[PDB]
From Swiss-Prot, chains A, B:
Function text: Kinase that can phosphorylate various inositol polyphosphate such as Ins(3,4,5,6)P4 or Ins(1,3,4)P3 and participates in phytic acid biosynthesis in developing seeds. Phosphorylates Ins(3,4,5,6)P4 at position 1 to form Ins(1,3,4,5,6)P5. This reaction is thought to have regulatory importance, since Ins(3,4,5,6)P4 is an inhibitor of plasma membrane Ca(2+)-activated Cl(-) channels, while Ins(1,3,4,5,6)P5 is not. Also phosphorylates Ins(1,3,4)P3 on O-5 and O-6 to form Ins(1,3,4,6)P4, an essential molecule in the hexakisphosphate (InsP6) pathway.
Organism expressing this protein natively: Zea mays (Maize)
Names of the cofactor(s): Mg(2+)
Gene that specifies this protein: ITPK1
The name this protein goes by in its record: Inositol-tetrakisphosphate 1-kinase 1
Tissue expression per record: Expressed in the embryo of 15 day after pollination. Expressed in kernels at earlier stages but at very low levels. Expression in the embryo peaks at 15 days after pollination and then declines. No expression is detected from endosperm and vegetative tissues.
Protein's GO biological process: inositol trisphosphate metabolic process; myo-inositol hexakisphosphate biosynthetic process; seed development
Enzyme Commission number(s) from the entry: 2.7.1.134, 2.7.1.159, 2.7.4.21
First-level EC class: transferase
């Protein structure tokens, strides 16, 4: 009964959250050995590996994965950098998701306003017919975590202070609720987040968060399945809203590589079954 | 005095316009031999080449250029497919152009509205505060020429009939004038195109086109230079408007790979000097 080496190249803070003793031991009990990748040596001098999982960015890290992928074509990489690239530009990302087909629920993409420079952020006429609150997000991101963050914006003044180029999306047809859907291979958890039309400094109104494992479950798996086929990613979460006008249409508003799976209890079982699948194809 | 082989992989219609006897003879008089690439054989069995120019798309054509670039690292390709990729998504394209710096003129990028689906094209509230006429353009293109075309749209009804995903840009601050700037290496020609706020069926008002080789010439070369450094393309034209509110700010609204250089008289001299530079680096 052979053993599988699962290499992992993660920042220390992501190691602390995701590589917990309970995951290491569960995986070792099933013949899978989680081995940290030395950031101080080339990847080519390390291993061998039966599977490689990472959350690092840079041209050096990318070169290594290209080298590695050429030297070792059979060894799965989670995820390949070419596939994480698809998230780099918010507008290209949502385009790749739009090329899905179709069920008693429909799923669409909300329209986006792209503002490239400071000047336009002042004097672009259309901005003055937007409804608040708005989701703002930098246009390009991969790397620094702040680029991955999506802001709720309550005032025109507060927009005027964001750093362009950014993407603007209306949030008013959502009923104040975002569904964050964690995916590993085939699914995991949904966080329901409720936001409000008034900020909190403006009026003392409340926001709330709950967890489950709320939109139809057969539909969420249909979506999650298509995102994975289209993006070629195995580890992502995706933000979605109900269009509460009809009340049966859903919209994908965001996608994030390798989110915080350790926040969900029982993540160790889900990720260990995933590693098992990946090293047996 | 050795001879340089300039291979060319062009569609027949593009061969008829661009590969004229006058260019073939001018280049042969200077020791450069224009050789057609056989579309019926692999590129790897043809040549050898000192320079390769093309306007073909597809995964087969791309494989060949990747093969070729690995076998022949010193041989310049005009242009490399990785660089033509930068034009594929209108929003990523304008992002790459936005990462230029800065002169008595400024240059910016107009804001864009991205509409991904039929539903949103009907019911997205912001569309109703846009000013007409609008430039509409498909979001993704490279390949079929219709995707490369940018439409002037005069009515809301006429928008309602476009195929999503598309990008919308306001055209009202331009004074009804677009400057098309042809670039080869370092510059070439400007077409001044004048469009109007009423379509022509609506009112019998006129549009006009003139040519020159109107914005400052030192500035046009500053822009053209930066586009080339940033996109890594040697053969493009770029559309630009004056913001006629101030009257000294210009905006880049579009970029097209390898346009119709043969429409400009004296193109043969410009392209032959270009081939000379390319085979001597
Ligand atoms: O800003 P980031 O470093 O990308 O961190 C985010 C962010 O955390 P902050 O509250 O510190 O900004 C999210 O919080 P929200 O702003 O979306 O509420 C959090 O989501 P949760 O609060 O729901 O834990 C998310 O975690 P996830 O990746 O699980 O979506 C986490 O991202 P990282 O922990 O991956 O960096
Ligand atoms: O639609 P495309 O095949 O991309 O053809 C276009 C288009 O021609 P149509 O008039 O047939 O649509 C342009 O015309 P406009 O619509 O912009 O007026 C023309 O520009 P000119 O009329 O100014 O010749 C342009 O040529 P260029 O590439 O020189 O910008 C030419 O593109 P191709 O000849 O490259 O296909
Ligand atoms: Cl985690
Ligand atoms: Cl031509």
């Amino acid at each position: 009964p052979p053993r599988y080496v699962i290499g992992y190249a993660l920042a220390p803070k992501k190691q602390q959250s995701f590589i917990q003793p309970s995951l290491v031991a569960q995986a070792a009990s099933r013949g899978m050995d989680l081995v940290p990748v030395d950031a101080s040596q080339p990847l080519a001098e390390q291993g061998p590996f039966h599977l490689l999982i990472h959350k690092l960015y840079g041209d050096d890290w990318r070169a290594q994965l290209v080298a590695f992928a050429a030297r070792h074509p059979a060894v799965p990489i989670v995820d390949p950098p070419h596939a994480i690239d698809r998230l780099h530009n918010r507008i290209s990302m949502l385009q790749v998701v739009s090329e899905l087909d179709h069920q008693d629920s429909t799923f669409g993409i909300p329209s986006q306003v792209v503002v490239y420079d400071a000047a336009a952020l002042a004097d672009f006429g259309l901005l003055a017919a937007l409804r608040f609150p708005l989701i703002a997000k930098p246009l390009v991101a991969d790397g620094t975590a702040k680029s991955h963050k999506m802001s709720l914006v309550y005032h025109r003044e507060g927009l005027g202070k964001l750093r362009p180029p950014l993407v603007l999306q209306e949030f008013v047809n959502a009923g104040g609720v975002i569904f964050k859907v964690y995916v590993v291979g085939g699914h995991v958890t949904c966080v329901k987040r409720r936001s409000l039309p008034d900020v909190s400094p403006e009026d003392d109104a409340s926001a709330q968060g709950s967890v489950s494992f709320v939109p139809p479950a057969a539909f969420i798996n249909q979506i999650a399945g298509g995102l994975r086929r289209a993006l070629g990613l195995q580890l992502f979460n995706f933000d979605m809203i109900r269009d509460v006008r009809a009340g049966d249409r859903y919209l994908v508003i965001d996608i994030n590589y390798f989110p915080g799976y350790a926040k969900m209890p029982g993540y160790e079982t889900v990720l260990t079954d995933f590693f098992w699948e990946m090293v047996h194809k």
